[PDB]
Amino acid sequence: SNPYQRGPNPTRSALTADGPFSVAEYTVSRLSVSGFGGGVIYYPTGTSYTFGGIAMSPGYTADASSLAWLGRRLASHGFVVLVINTNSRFDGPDSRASQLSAALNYLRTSSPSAVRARLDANRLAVAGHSMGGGGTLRIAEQNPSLKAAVPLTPWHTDKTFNTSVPVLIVGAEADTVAPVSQHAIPFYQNLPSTTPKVYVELCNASHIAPNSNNAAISVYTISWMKLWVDNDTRYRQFLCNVNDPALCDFRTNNRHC
Ligand SMILES: [Cl-]
Ligand SMILES: [Cl-]
């Protein structure tokens, strides 16, 4: 049962480190693509399976290297992951959405044959930090064929996204760049009631929490991607009846349970 199932039965502990798949890396140079600023693809190797794909945007003034740890972590749990560089480091959230859109088309159509051989382009998802997270909400609303969206410490001036794509938002309690009361929590609140949605808030963490290995971001991002990109109900346990000391808030409409 479940053609998309990959990897062993999960434990929390296994989800805080790199997973069972070996990972290859391919550098997409800036000038080799129109529509975004290149980036790095992390993708499984040593395997004959196909996997869902994820496009992920860094944050304001940031490089793709800021999220390398998470691109590798995801790919090692069984995902083809393209972390973009933006055309300009100063690009805003809606610009980042359009570049996510270009990056997804690139992954499907024009990436190297070794990458395409590992990708099931029918199952794609998006994630992003800061302003990249605002771009994630924008594209989830523009393109409801996506399987999931994970905005990390997100920032946007627009507060309402009418999307049927399942969304998990990571807020940081002590974020002063995108305070959760103005950004993350309103985005959560304003998503449709019928859309499966989760908000998790990291205790004593600031806007830079996504820039380095973080156990909570690892568990919740892996689990949400697994549950919706792979229909993998083994990951429901990490997302249901949550009692996590690392979190200082938790909200959900509990549609995913
Ligand atoms: Cl913009
Ligand atoms: Cl092959």
Numbering used by the authors: 2 to 258
Quote the study's own text:
Computer-aided enzyme engineering performed by Tournier et al. introduced an Ile at LCC position F243 to enhance the enzyme’s catalytic activity by further expanding the substrate-binding site. Additionally, thermostability was increased to 94 °C by disulfide bond formation between D238C and S283C in combination with mutation Y127G.
After successfully implementing a batch crystallization setup for ICCG variant L50Y, ICCGY mutants were generated according to strategies to either increase crystallizability (Q6E and T110E) or, as a control, not to increase crystallizability (negative controls T26E, Q183K, and Q238K). Mutant T26E crystallization was microscopically visible after 22 h, similar to the WT’s crystallization onset under the same conditions (26 h). However, T26E crystallized in larger (344.5 µm ± 63.2) and fewer crystals compared to the WT (247.8 µm ± 70.9; 25 crystals), indicating a trend to a reduction in nucleation events. No interaction partner could be identified for the mutants T26E, Q183K, and Q238K within the standard range of electrostatic interactions (<4 Å), as intended for the selected negative controls. Furthermore, the crystal contacts of the three mutants remained comparable to the ICCGY WT. Furthermore, mutations T26E, Q183K, and Q238K neither resulted in unintended electrostatic interactions nor affected crystal packing, as the crystal contacts remained similar. The three negative control ICCGY mutants were meant to crystallize, but not with increased crystallizability compared to the WT, which could be demonstrated in this study. The negative controls T26E, Q183K, and Q238K, which did not aim to enhance interaction at the crystal contacts, showed no increase in crystallizability. The consistent space group among the crystallized variants of this study (ICCGY and mutants T26E, T110E, Q183K, and Q238K), all crystallized in batches with identical conditions, emphasizes these assumptions.
